């Protein structure tokens, strides 16, 4: 078949909803294994300065025992059936998911229901996790990449909830109480804020009945005065430079404000980012890479690596790049990078945009490879778009992009716009903000 007919053969994702508001979505395949999980509209963007880190603390407690399965009982059950239980928290979403044999879907759904509704939160466990989290904060401090990205959010979204890290400040970790957590939970873990998603060898009808059976008790009301809604987050052209000449390589992240999840412009932006691409010293292409930034960097040894990114949030986002380089290569790297954004705004060619479109097509499909990536796409999509966008639609959106669309969309977000800049390490050579700003036009 052609790439076109193959697109129309992907089973359509089935979506249902319970009385309490919980959405149930699934994509059936014939895999003897599956992934099922709960995606929640909860994250640090929903936290205030007082409880920032609450969600991450809960993630630490989620698998430590439930009222029905105290202590390591939940753990033993997951392990004995050979399943895998994982979780993650971001500034807007939280997810708990299980990879298991398709025949074990009923127990998998029960366990998730149990986890999301009956978490013990034993005072002694809370004290133990407190120390674990503090140690994780210390470890994260050694990850220059994680530090620079937290810094980018701190400065770009300064004064708003998006400026907050997911883990929260250490003093919050030392002071968060069970009361704080149960409070956070009663407020955010409601059925209308959750999506039960599954992908693999199972039928929607079976998942739906299991959901009715195990999630019906989940609250779908809350009230009116306590319905955590999101306010837009102001973006600020600014710079944060943490100079540390003791570190061997400098990390720099720069971005302009992105449009947010729902905007159609994200497709063209993804095409443009694909044109500039990514790179690191282990890439075999070197001097022949198609991206001018990549080949210049490789032939002139300008950096160890770089990556463009389009981080999306509800109504805003960070569109830009991150690079790692020697202290004497920062200005050159910034010069070439900004020159490439400007070239795309004013002179993107049909041939490079086609390449970008093909890169995006390949990335889209190769990403949805396996029950876990698919299940995550279902969960997240339902939370963000309110629907699963089919591949055939993505193709239509990508197809609509041409050189004209790329120049116009890039001009809209990059041209003469104030960026947010974060630097960490031996950054004496990181350009002054005025010089960076002038580089935007």
């Amino acid at each position: 078949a052609t790439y076109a007919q193959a697109l129309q053969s992907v089973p359509e994702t089935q979506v249902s909803q319970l009385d309490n508001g919980l959405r149930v979505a699934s994509e059936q395949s014939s895999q003897p294994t599956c992934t099922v999980g709960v995606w929640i509209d909860a994250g640090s963007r929903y936290e205030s300065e007082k409880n920032n880190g609450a969600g991450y603390f809960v993630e630490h407690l989620a698998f430590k025992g439930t009222k029905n399965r105290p202590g390591n009982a939940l753990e033993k059950e997951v392990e004995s059936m050979g399943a895998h239980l994982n979780a993650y928290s971001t500034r807007e979403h939280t997810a708990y998911y299980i990879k298991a044999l398709s025949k074990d879907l009923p127990k998998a759904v029960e366990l998730l229901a149990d986890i999301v509704q009956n978490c013990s939160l034993e005072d002694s466990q809370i004290e133990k996790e407190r120390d674990v989290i503090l140690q994780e904060l210390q470890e994260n401090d050694t990850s220059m990449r994680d530090v620079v990205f937290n810094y980018l959010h701190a400065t770009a979204f300064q004064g708003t909830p998006l400026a907050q890290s997911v883990e929260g400040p250490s003093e919050n970790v030392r002071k968060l109480s069970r009361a704080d957590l149960t409070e956070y939970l009663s407020r955010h873990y409601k059925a209308p804020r959750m999506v039960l998603a599954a992908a693999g060898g199972l039928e929607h009808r079976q998942l739906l009945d299991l959901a009715q059976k195990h999630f019906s008790g989940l609250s779908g009301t809350y009230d009116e005065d306590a319905v955590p809604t999101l306010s837009p987050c102001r973006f600020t052209g600014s710079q944060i430079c943490h100079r540390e000449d003791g570190l061997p390589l400098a990390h720099v992240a720069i971005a302009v404000e992105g449009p947010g999840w729902a905007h159609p412009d994200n497709v063209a932006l993804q095409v443009a980012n694909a044109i500039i691409g990514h790179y690191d010293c282990t890439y075999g292409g070197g001097a022949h890479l198609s991206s001018p930034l990549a080949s210049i960097a490789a032939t002139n040894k300008l950096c160890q690596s770089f990556q463009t990114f389009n981080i999306c949030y509800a109504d805003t986002g960070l569109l830009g790049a991150h690079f790692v380089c020697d202290h004497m290569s920062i200005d050159d790297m910034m010069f070439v990078l900004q020159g490439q954004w400007m070239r795309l705004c004013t002179s993107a060619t049909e041939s490079e945009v086609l390449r970008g479109k093909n890169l995006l097509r390949n990335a889209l499909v190769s990403h949805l490879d396996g029950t876990t990536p698919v299940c995550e796409d279902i969960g997240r999509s339902l939370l963000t778009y309110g629907r699963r966008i089919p591949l055939a639609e993505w193709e239509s959106r990508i197809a609509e992009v041409d050189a004209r669309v790329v120049r116009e969309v890039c001009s809209k977000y990059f041209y003469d716009q104030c960026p947010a800049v974060a630097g960490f390490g031996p950054i004496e050579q990181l350009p002054d903000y005025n010089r960076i700003r002038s580089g935007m036009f």
């Binding site: 690191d280 790692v324 995006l360 390949n362």
Partner: protein
């Protein structure tokens, strides 16, 4: 190609059981090199 590796390599973490868990090797290693993606080493 299109998808960047999970971890990008540069040349020239752990402080708790939780973050140490999974680091012990369990299988023979595999070495991969790419045209478009960061190299990797498994197990």
């Amino acid at each position: 190609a299109a998808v960047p590796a999970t971890s990008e390599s540069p040349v020239l973490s752990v402080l708790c059981r939780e973050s140490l868990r999974g680091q012990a090797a369990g299988r023979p290693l595999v070495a991969s090199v790419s045209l478009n993606v960061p190299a990797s080493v498994r197990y």
